[PDB]
Structure formats: structure tokens, C-alpha cells
Amino acid sequence: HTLVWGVWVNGVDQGDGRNIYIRSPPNNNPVKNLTSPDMTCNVDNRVVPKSVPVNAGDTLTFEWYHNTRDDDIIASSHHGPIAVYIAPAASNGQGNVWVKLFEDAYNVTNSTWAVDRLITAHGQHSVVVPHVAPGDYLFRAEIIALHEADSLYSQNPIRGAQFYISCAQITINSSDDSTPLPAGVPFPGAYTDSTPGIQFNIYTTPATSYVAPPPSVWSGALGGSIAQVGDASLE
Ligand SMILES: [Cu+2]
């Protein structure tokens, strides 16, 4: 159970974005139904009044929280991967539009899941803003908690992979468009009951064998991190 509080741009806090530049849902409960319209941008997908200005090459940091800012972030039980997708905002996230900018699942070197490292990072993970066409975008941050993912939600709706989905309104101003954004995948639709990484038993199957759900990270993506960029406590 986790939500996005706001974003940082080049280590500068853009301030509380809830219902302002984040299409915030009414609470931190997960989406679990893979065919739900809620898979796009969670249960309250609508245009919110602000879009955060960035340029291509900026570091964009999402900041998550559980109940209050810079708390426990997400229950430690919620091991799983983190992904970030981008879509042109005029799509409203509909159709074959989501392009993957970031994936971090289980780190063999560190013996840690992305969620474990997200807690250590005070809820912060980042991407480099890609060199796409200037304009308005949705950045869809997705945490998949796998602690109940041994079952499919379609077989036992009390269990299943848990999707914590947050869509940020981002406006890309300066971009040379060296990597024009292609068509992407649909949400709902990209993940199905047979997709690798959706049904996974963390109690019985080693995390070294986990394969995150496709699609692959786009060739135009410039990278990211799971690391604290900014110290909320200094504010
Ligand atoms: Cu939870």
C-alpha cells in the first residue's frame, strides 16, 4: 500500500503533487484485476490541473509514501519490481501507447528486490527524461508487490500480484527529439494471466529465477536509479 507524494527535477522538489500534477487515486489500495480499466492510471484517471515542466536529460525522481511523507514508504513484505512507462498525454493512456523507460526487478549482486531498495531510498526512484518530441506526457510508475502472487487474482481475488500505479503529468519543453517515441503496449492488456512475472511464488521460487513482465525497456531509454535524490527532512 503506497502512493506518489510528488516528484523532484534535477534534485529540486516540485512540492506536493497529490491531485495537482499526480492523477492520484483516493487511497493506497492496489489494482489487481489485469483486465481492469484501472490498470491504466489507477482508479481515478482524469486530467489534473498542473503538468511538471522538464527538459530532455533532466533527472525525474518519483517519491512514494505509505501513510505520511517519508515514512516506511511500503510494507517490507511487498517485495517486487519497479517499472516506469511513458505515453503521450493526449492518449489519456488508452491504446497501444505505453513505452517502458525503466525496469528493476531482483538485483543478484545486492540480493535485493527493487521495492527493498525503494524503502532504503526514502521512496525515491528516478529516470532520465528521454529525447522525445516536446509536449505533454504521462509517466506511469508501477510497483508490483509479489508477496501474494503465487495465485492469479483471476483464480483467487483475495490474492494476486498487486499493482501500485501512479500517473504523473509531465511536460517536456526542451528536447531535440533524437529518439522519437514509438507505439507501445496497452494497459490494461500488456499483462495477462500467462505473462512472465505476474504469477510468482516468492516463498518457493528463488528470486534469482524471476523474469519481470515484458515489454522490454525501449532502446531510447537513458536509464535511471533507485536512490535518494533529495532530503525531504530539510524542508
Ligand atoms: Cu499493501
DSSP the chain: --EEEEEEETTEE----BTTTB---SSSPPB--TT-GGGTT-S-----S--EEE-TT-EEEEEEESSSTTSS-S-TT----EEEEEEEGGGTT-SS-BEEEEEE-EETTTTEEHHHHHHHTTTEEEEEPP---SEEEEEEEEEEE-TTTTS-TTT-TTSS-EEEEEEEEEEE-S---SS-----B-TTTS--TTSTTTS--TTTS-GGG--PPSPPPPTT---EEES--S-GGG-
Q: 93, 88, 124, 133: which is closest to 14 by C-alpha?
A: 124
Please tell me whether 203 is known to bind a ligand.
no
94 is in an annotated binding site: no
CA 74 – ligand 1 centroid, Å: 7
Q: Is 67 annotated as a binding residue?
A: yes
Residues 6+ apart with CB under 8 A from 166: 3, 4, 22, 23, 24, 41, 42, 62, 64, 140, 141
Q: What is the resolution of this structure in A?
A: 1.4
Going from the Cα of 30 to the center of ligand 1, the distance in angstroms, rounded, reads 7
Q: Is residue 58 marked as binding? A: yes
Question: Does the annotation list 1 as a binding residue?
Answer: yes
Q: What is the CATH number of the domain that holds 184?
A: 2.70.50.70
Residue 8 lies in domain: 3-234
Cβ neighbours of 182 (radius 10 Å) = 12
CA 2 / ligand 1 centre spacing (Å): 7
Sign of CA dihedral 109, 111, 115, 118: negative
Based on the structure, what is the number of domains in the chain?
Answer: 1
Way the structure was solved: X-ray
Q: At residue 17, what is the residue type?
A: G
